Amino acid sequence: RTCRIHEISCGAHSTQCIPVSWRCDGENDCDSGEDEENCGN
Amino acid sequence: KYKTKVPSPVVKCCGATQCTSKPHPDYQCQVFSGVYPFMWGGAYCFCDT
Amino acid sequence: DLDTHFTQYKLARPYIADCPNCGHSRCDSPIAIEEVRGDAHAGVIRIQTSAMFGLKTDGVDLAYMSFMNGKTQKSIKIDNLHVRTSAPCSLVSHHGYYILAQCPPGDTVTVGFHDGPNRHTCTVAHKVEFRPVGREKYRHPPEHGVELPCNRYTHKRADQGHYVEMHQPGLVADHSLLSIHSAKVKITVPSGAQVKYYCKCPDVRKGITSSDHTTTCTDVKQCRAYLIDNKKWVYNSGRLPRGEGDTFKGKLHVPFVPVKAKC
Amino acid sequence: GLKTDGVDLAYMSFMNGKTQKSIKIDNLHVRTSAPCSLVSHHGYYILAQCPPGDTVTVGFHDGPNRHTCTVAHKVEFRPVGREKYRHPPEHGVELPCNRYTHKRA
Amino acid sequence: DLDTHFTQYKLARPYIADCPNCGHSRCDSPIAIEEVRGDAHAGVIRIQTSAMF
Amino acid sequence: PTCGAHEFQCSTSSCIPISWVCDDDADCSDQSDESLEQCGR
Amino acid sequence: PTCGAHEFQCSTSSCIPISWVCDDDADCSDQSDESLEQCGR
Amino acid sequence: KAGSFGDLQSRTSTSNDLYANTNLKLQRPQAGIVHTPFTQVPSGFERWK
Amino acid sequence: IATLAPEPLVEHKHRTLILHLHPDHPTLLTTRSLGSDANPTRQWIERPTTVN
Ligand SMILES: [Ca+2]
Ligand SMILES: [Ca+2]
Ligand SMILES: [Ca+2]
């Protein structure tokens, strides 16, 4: 991890970094499916 | 005599989509996985199978 | 006035959708037969296509039609617009997406139009039959006969209380706008196109751009491209992909509504 | 496909007397009861997709000439499977059939 | 002679008479099909019209 | 005989709507909807 | 997928004869036999 | 019964509630094209005529 | 590509199967039993009919 403050890491397995705006977009980006969960209602 | 109308399908083609139960006479839902369509000007999206 | 009927038909554009047996191998055609209705009492039918008839880029003109070849909406003078089933039918009128014709019985429905040396044909498999009126099974309407109440499709375009809905078009995929600049792929975005992209060259590189945006990846085969045109709307066919978010419920009248007449 | 000087798929050649003419394919029509949509042509052979009927006729315009020839051969429609359709559908069941090849080889 | 078959036909003219279904709505046309005769043995018919050929 | 406010009355007590006048059609038996005094052609 | 001396392989076990290469017909979904580099046009 | 007389039942010609069972079943699109196919029994009102 | 018939309507009874069939093309229905004798039937259905 240890990315910039405008980006959030995903998966916590390969330490890959994505921007925050790609939340609950419906596309499986990372290897783990944590990026499609905990989105807004 | 009836007339069955078909709305435009959604193609979210990297992942999966689900529907609710809309109130309509003889309403139908289905989800078909791994279609890989081909429009004009090449294939629709990159995600194979 | 003509523009009273043609008001909400100026706000929509033709589209390219799937047509079986367009040539011999079910290509994508600018004219695509959807929902031909054939339950009138004299063999008259109403065919809905994807092209636009009687509408230029400016004004309205009854001899001009509009269609698409790619992303450019092209207008062309109507010269030979033919409708045939098993013998060549004689068409009656045309307004927007809809053609009206008086056809002999058969099993196919064929439309076509020439622009230069092109053909642009589409053939759908719809069983159209001739329905006589009364207690005699004649095969063609006669010169002299007793008058009876028959239901037909009307000759005049008007509102008449029947509506269809248009929708904002979804993403249309174009691959001719992705080219390599020197060794890295470049996106050509014409005139506020808002071209989407999706690269998986080492990883996901999705985003929306509005101009230039020279992509820092190698091959043109590992990145998809789209095109967001929201100026004109389309009828929500079953052969077009839907939009992403909420799409507005538009309205569009059907020109040749069924009426009751004398046969 | 031959224009007496090479190979070009938009050309045809024929004889009017003892002189072997060569023209461009302008209106090559095949009709049975309705006009068919032809697929390919190679040498002596034309491939076409025709509706059923009792006659087969082809023709080509040389100048203002017509050049028609109508033979009497009964051609039918043969569906595949256990349903007797009269035109191939948009959707359904893929089944093995036997048809003439698109390719020239 | 070819002129012998047209001596009484120079005194005649075409005319406009009604016929159903030009397009959709039973025109008045220079071509008007009257008395189609089809009693031959190979599908050859003779059609009398209003125009002059 | 007077029709409604959204109807144009040609002759012989048959009236067509205001959307149907000056549009190259014969919606009345006297062709008053496409006459020279209304369309001005 | 090594084919013989009279067969041309497009991609992923798809073999066509050498006479089927550069003849204005796409016999492969890869379309390698009628490409810009293989045909030379 | 989907094929005889009551495939489509409506209380008034302008009514908003509709009864409809026409055995509408969706079908999988094939060979990579975007279209929505279906299969259903024909209208019994057209059969009653 | 060959056509697909509309699905038949199955109605059960005591040792009886009732099929309401509404074809759009002349469609073939062949049955047999899985016993010692099959007793096969074979017919082409053109009109909407009903068999037991
Ligand atoms: Ca995401
Ligand atoms: Ca008018
Ligand atoms: Ca080849």
UniProtKB/Swiss-Prot annotation, chain C:
In its record, the post-translational modification comment is:
Palmitoylated via thioester bonds. These palmitoylations may induce disruption of the C-terminus transmembrane. This would result in the reorientation of E2 C-terminus from lumenal to cytoplasmic side. N-glycosylated.
Topology relative to the lipid bilayer, per the entry, is: Single-pass type I membrane protein
Ranges facing Extracellular side = 1-263
Superkingdom: Viruses
Q: Where in the cell is it found?
A: Virion membrane; Host cell membrane
Task: Describe the function of this protein.
Answer: Plays a role in viral attachment to target host cell, by binding to the cell receptor. Synthesized as a p62 precursor which is processed by furin at the cell membrane just before virion budding, giving rise to E2-E1 heterodimer. The p62-E1 heterodimer is stable, whereas E2-E1 is unstable and dissociate at low pH. p62 is processed at the last step, presumably to avoid E1 fusion activation before its final export to cell surface.
Its subunit composition reads:
Processing of the precursor of protein E3/E2 into E2 and E3 results in a heterodimer of the spike glycoproteins E2 and E1. Spike at virion surface are constituted of three E2-E1 heterodimers. Interacts with 6K protein.
Report what the protein is called.
Spike glycoprotein E2
Q: Which organism is it from?
A: Eastern equine encephalitis virus (strain Florida 91-469)
Highest classification ranks of the organism: Viruses, Riboviria, Orthornavirae, Kitrinoviricota, Alsuviricetes
From Swiss-Prot, chain D:
Q: How is it modified after translation?
A: Palmitoylated via thioester bonds. These palmitoylations may induce disruption of the C-terminus transmembrane. This would result in the reorientation of E2 C-terminus from lumenal to cytoplasmic side. N-glycosylated.
**Membrane topology classification:** Single-pass type I membrane protein
In terms of superkingdom, the source organism counts as Viruses
Entry's localization field: Virion membrane; Host cell membrane
Task: Describe the subunit structure.
Answer: Processing of the precursor of protein E3/E2 into E2 and E3 results in a heterodimer of the spike glycoproteins E2 and E1. Spike at virion surface are constituted of three E2-E1 heterodimers. Interacts with 6K protein.
Its function, per the record, reads: Plays a role in viral attachment to target host cell, by binding to the cell receptor. Synthesized as a p62 precursor which is processed by furin at the cell membrane just before virion budding, giving rise to E2-E1 heterodimer. The p62-E1 heterodimer is stable, whereas E2-E1 is unstable and dissociate at low pH. p62 is processed at the last step, presumably to avoid E1 fusion activation before its final export to cell surface.
The name of this protein is Spike glycoprotein E2
Q: Which organism is it from?
A: Eastern equine encephalitis virus (strain Florida 91-469)
Span covered, complete protein: 378 to 482 of 1242
Swiss-Prot record, chains F, G:
The domain of life is: Eukaryota
Q: Where is the LDL-receptor class A domain?
A: 1-41
Q: Which body tissues produce this protein? A: Abundant in heart and skeletal muscle; also ovary and kidney; not in liver.
Covalent S-S links between cysteines:
C3-C15, C10-C28, C22-C39
UniProt PTM comment: Glycosylated.
Q: Where in the cell is it found?
A: Cell membrane; Membrane, Clathrin-coated pit
State the associated disorder.
Answer: Cerebellar ataxia, impaired intellectual development, and dysequilibrium syndrome 1: An autosomal recessive, congenital, non-progressive cerebellar ataxia associated with disturbed equilibrium, delayed ambulation, intellectual disability, cerebellar hypoplasia and mild cerebral gyral simplification. Additional features include short stature, strabismus, pes planus and, rarely, seizures.
Assembly description: Homooligomer. Binds to the extracellular matrix protein Reelin/RELN. Interacts with LRP8. Interacts with LDLRAP1. Interacts with SNX17. Interacts with DAB1. Interacts with PCSK9. Interacts with PAFAH1B3 and PAFAH1B2, the catalytic complex of (PAF-AH (I)) heterotetrameric enzyme; these interactions may modulate the Reelin pathway. Interacts with STX5; this interaction mediates VLDLR translocation from the endoplasmic reticulum to the plasma membrane. Interacts with CLU. (Microbial infection) Interacts with protein VP1 of the minor-group human rhinoviruses (HRVs) through the second and third LDL-receptor class A domains.
- Specify the protein name: Very low-density lipoprotein receptor
Q: Which gene encodes it?
A: VLDLR
Fragment boundaries within the full protein? 191 to 231 of 873
Swiss-Prot record, chain I:
**Domain of life of the source:** Viruses
| Protein's cellular compartments | Virion membrane; Host cell membrane
Q: How is it modified after translation?
A: Palmitoylated via thioester bonds. These palmitoylations may induce disruption of the C-terminus transmembrane. This would result in the reorientation of E2 C-terminus from lumenal to cytoplasmic side.
Membrane topology recorded in Swiss-Prot or TrEMBL:
Single-pass type I membrane protein
Q: Could you give the subunit structure recorded for this chain?
A: Processing of the precursor of protein E3/E2 into E2 and E3 results in a heterodimer of the spike glycoproteins E2 and E1. Spike at virion surface are constituted of three E2-E1 heterodimers. Interacts with 6K protein.
Q: What task does this protein carry out?
A: Plays a role in viral attachment to target host cell, by binding to the cell receptor. Synthesized as a p62 precursor which is processed by furin at the cell membrane just before virion budding, giving rise to E2-E1 heterodimer. The p62-E1 heterodimer is stable, whereas E2-E1 is unstable and dissociate at low pH. p62 is processed at the last step, presumably to avoid E1 fusion activation before its final export to cell surface.
Protein name (database record): Spike glycoprotein E2
Organism listed in the record: Eastern equine encephalitis virus (strain Florida 91-469) (EEEV)
Q: Which residues of the full protein are shown?
A: 588 to 639 of 1242
